[PDB]
Write an enzyme that holds these catalytic residues in place. Structure first.
Site, short mmCIF file in Angstrom:
data_model
loop_
_atom_site.label_atom_id
_atom_site.label_comp_id
_atom_site.label_asym_id
_atom_site.label_seq_id
_atom_site.Cartn_x
_atom_site.Cartn_y
_atom_site.Cartn_z
N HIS A 146 -57.95 -98.27 61.99
CA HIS A 146 -58.23 -99.41 61.12
C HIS A 146 -58.91 -98.99 59.81
O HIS A 146 -59.13 -99.85 58.94
CB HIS A 146 -59.11 -100.42 61.88
CG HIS A 146 -59.25 -101.76 61.23
ND1 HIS A 146 -60.40 -102.15 60.58
CD2 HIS A 146 -58.41 -102.83 61.18
CE1 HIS A 146 -60.26 -103.39 60.13
NE2 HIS A 146 -59.06 -103.82 60.48
N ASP A 196 -61.39 -109.99 49.26
CA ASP A 196 -61.76 -108.71 49.85
C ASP A 196 -62.50 -107.84 48.83
O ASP A 196 -62.58 -108.16 47.63
CB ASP A 196 -60.52 -107.99 50.38
CG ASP A 196 -60.81 -107.21 51.65
OD1 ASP A 196 -61.98 -106.74 51.81
OD2 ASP A 196 -59.89 -107.06 52.47
N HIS A 200 -62.04 -111.50 53.91
CA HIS A 200 -61.77 -110.26 54.65
C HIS A 200 -62.84 -109.19 54.45
O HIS A 200 -62.66 -108.07 54.94
CB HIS A 200 -60.39 -109.72 54.26
CG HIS A 200 -59.78 -108.81 55.28
ND1 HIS A 200 -59.43 -107.51 55.01
CD2 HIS A 200 -59.44 -109.03 56.58
CE1 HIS A 200 -58.92 -106.95 56.09
NE2 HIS A 200 -58.91 -107.85 57.05
N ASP A 254 -62.71 -96.79 62.52
CA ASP A 254 -63.10 -97.40 61.26
C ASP A 254 -63.99 -96.44 60.47
O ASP A 254 -64.38 -95.38 60.97
CB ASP A 254 -63.80 -98.75 61.50
CG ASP A 254 -62.80 -99.89 61.63
OD1 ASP A 254 -61.94 -100.01 60.75
OD2 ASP A 254 -62.85 -100.67 62.61
C1 LIG Z 1 -51.13 -106.19 64.55
C2 LIG Z 1 -52.43 -106.78 65.10
C3 LIG Z 1 -53.53 -105.75 65.39
C4 LIG Z 1 -54.24 -105.27 64.12
O1 LIG Z 1 -53.80 -105.60 63.08
O2 LIG Z 1 -55.37 -104.44 64.19
C5 LIG Z 1 -56.37 -104.75 63.26
C6 LIG Z 1 -56.80 -106.22 63.43
C7 LIG Z 1 -56.99 -106.80 62.03
O3 LIG Z 1 -58.22 -106.35 61.52
P1 LIG Z 1 -58.92 -107.21 60.27
O4 LIG Z 1 -58.00 -107.18 59.07
O5 LIG Z 1 -59.12 -108.64 60.73
O6 LIG Z 1 -60.24 -106.60 59.84
O7 LIG Z 1 -58.01 -106.30 64.13
C8 LIG Z 1 -57.92 -106.57 65.50
O8 LIG Z 1 -57.82 -107.69 65.87
C9 LIG Z 1 -57.95 -105.44 66.53
C10 LIG Z 1 -58.48 -105.87 67.89
C11 LIG Z 1 -57.36 -106.32 68.83
#
Ligand SMILES: CCCC(=O)OC[C@H](COP(=O)(O)O)OC(=O)CCC
Length: 501
Positions: free
Chosen positions: A165, A197, A439, A464
């Site tokens: 991430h 963001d 975000h 992260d």
């Molecule tokens: C395709 C969906 C998964 C994903 O995209 O992985 C990052 C997501 C979005 O991160 P964010 O943009 O909200 O910070 O976070 C999560 O939910 C992970 C825990 C299951």
């Protein structure tokens, strides 16, 4: 110049993850927040950049971000290191990478380039690493021959939902851009309802720290390319995988200082890269808190796993950042709570830290994405709560468990908490009709120390990364450019918790 906030955080990190110092976390001196000439707060890269402009017609923040990305990549002499959540950079983000790489090659350089995306098990990658690599080669034209590409998509744990991430652009181990901004056109560019963001840009030793962090991810990624269920890898020109690109570029000479800013770089390895930091004596008294509102299906790495802490120092880094607050703390996030199940609903130690702050008279502001935001799991800007009450009710609960009685809790909660949904102008919604999506992954403390990075405060077990800066001057810029405007407009969407004036 004293750094009491970084000092407390450094102690937490050396206790949690001593073996990861120099790779997954690192304190450095002598950094520069990388602002252009005549724009001193320009190191703070906000998107879309339309404070008090409900129509947001000239999205100058997005343009400044894309321009800074291209310029940093254009300056690349040796290495370009990109990580993101999937998909691979597209739209204007890909234009920045292509344009900057062509300029670098035009200036006589033969740069090595790593591009890493994390992929959820449910997420289907449209443009796979081999196809993305072929697409970059075509767009690079004649320059392709001088560019060494490593393109890879990765998932470190299918059952514990862990993948990259982090959102990084590191050039030559000298400059770094990081924050919450995903490099995909559908959230920030091609849209009339753009997500709010923030990224930050710096240069100096802390850029090398981010490089070292990416070397840890690519060491795992290159090894685990033996398992295509975990890693998809494509290189160009017959190149080998480059697990230690940043270390080779760094050499033996320590990074050169470029300014006077002290910075803690800190990340985490999620689940499935490394089980524990086995040099670590960390031995917490992990909180006994329940939640008759939710119980996890999966083993709770956030709240009930000592080992996971030791390979995810960023969790404790954020906790000790908030705990270092002696006067006030601003939290600006997509969410404080996660969707439960499958993940725990909240980080107990974080909420206990906050409650303690409220009880001691420290001011706490929490600004999250509007609950009106419904989106899928991977949506930039979605909300995982139905009402802001799920945050203040939780603080109220952790307050009675701390203090003893409920009206003591009410005096802490009602007199010291600001809780609101994000707005960036007087409009409650975009002109589009859709609501504002937030975000940020931002925490600021005592107008002196702040985190900007990719690590959300709500529970997630991803890889992260981000930076903690201590600098009254930089936090003043942050206050002026982001936090004071955010409160100016979000306070129209403030919550009054249950049981308050
Ligand atoms: C395709 C969906 C998964 C994903 O995209 O992985 C990052 C997501 C979005 O991160 P964010 O943009 O909200 O910070 O976070 C999560 O939910 C992970 C825990 C299951």
């Amino acid at each position: 110049p004293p750094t009491p906030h970084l000092d407390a955080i450094e102690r937490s990190l050396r206790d949690t993850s001593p073996g990861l110092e120099g790779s997954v976390w690192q304190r450095t001196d002598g950094n520069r927040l990388d602002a252009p000439d005549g724009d001193p707060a320009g190191w703070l890269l906000q998107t879309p950049g339309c404070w008090g402009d409900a129509g947001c017609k000239d999205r100058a923040g997005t343009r400044r971000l894309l321009d800074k990305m291209t310029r940093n990549i254009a300056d690349a002499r040796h290495t370009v290191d990109i990580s993101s959540l999937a998909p691979f950079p597209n739209g204007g983000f890909e234009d920045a990478v292509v344009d900057g790489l062509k300029a670098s090659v035009a200036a006589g350089h033969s740069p090595r380039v790593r591009i890493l995306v994390g992929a959820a098990p449910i997420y289907h990658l449209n443009v796979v690493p081999s196809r993305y690599r072929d697409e970059l080669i075509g767009k690079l034209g004649a320059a392709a021959g001088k560019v060494t590409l490593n393109v890879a998509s990765m998932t470190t744990s299918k059952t514990s939902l862990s993948w990259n991430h982090s959102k990084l652009l590191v050039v030559d181990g000298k400059t770094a851009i990081t924050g919450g901004i995903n490099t995909n056109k559908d959230d920030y560019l091609d849209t009339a309802h753009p997500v709010s963001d923030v990224d930050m840009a710096l240069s100096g030793p802390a850029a090398r720290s981010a490089g070292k962090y990416l070397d840890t991810l690519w060491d795992w990624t290159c090894r685990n390319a033996s398992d295509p269920a975990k890693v998809w890898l494509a290189t160009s020109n017959g190149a080998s995988c480059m697990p230690s690109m940043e270390q080779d570029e760094a050499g033996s000479a320590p990074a050169e200082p470029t300014g006077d800013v002290p910075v803690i770089a800190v990340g985490g390895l999620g689940v499935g890269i490394k089980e524990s930091d086995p040099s670590s004596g960390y031995h917490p008294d992990l909180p006994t808190a329940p939640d008759t509102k939710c119980t996890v299906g999966l083993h709770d790495n956030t709240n009930a796993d000592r080992d996971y802490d030791t390979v995810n120092p960023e969790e404790n880094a954020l906790r000790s950042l908030i705990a270092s607050a002696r006067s006030h703390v601003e939290i600006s996030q997509q969410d404080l709570n996660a969707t439960c199940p499958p993940l725990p609903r909240y980080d107990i130690r974080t909420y206990d830290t906050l409650a303690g702050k409220l009880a001691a008279g420290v001011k706490v502001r929490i600004v999250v994405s509007d609950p009106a935001n419904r989106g899928a799991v991977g949506s930039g800007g979605r909300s995982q709560i139905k009402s802001l009450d799920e945050i203040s009710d939780t603080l109220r609960t952790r307050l009675v468990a701390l203090t003893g009685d409920n009206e003591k809790a009410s005096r802490a909660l009602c007199g010291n908490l600001q809780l609101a949904s994000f707005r960036s102008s007087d409009a409650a919604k975009w002109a589009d009709g859709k609501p504002y999506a937030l975000h940020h992954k931002l925490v600021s403390v005592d107008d002196s120390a702040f985190y900007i990075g990719s690590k959300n405060l709500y529970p997630a077990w991803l890889q992260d990364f981000g930076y903690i800066v201590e600098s009254p001057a930089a936090a003043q810029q942050l206050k002026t450019e982001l936090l004071d405007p955010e409160w100016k407009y979000s306070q129209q969407a403030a919550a009054t918790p249950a049981g308050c004036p």
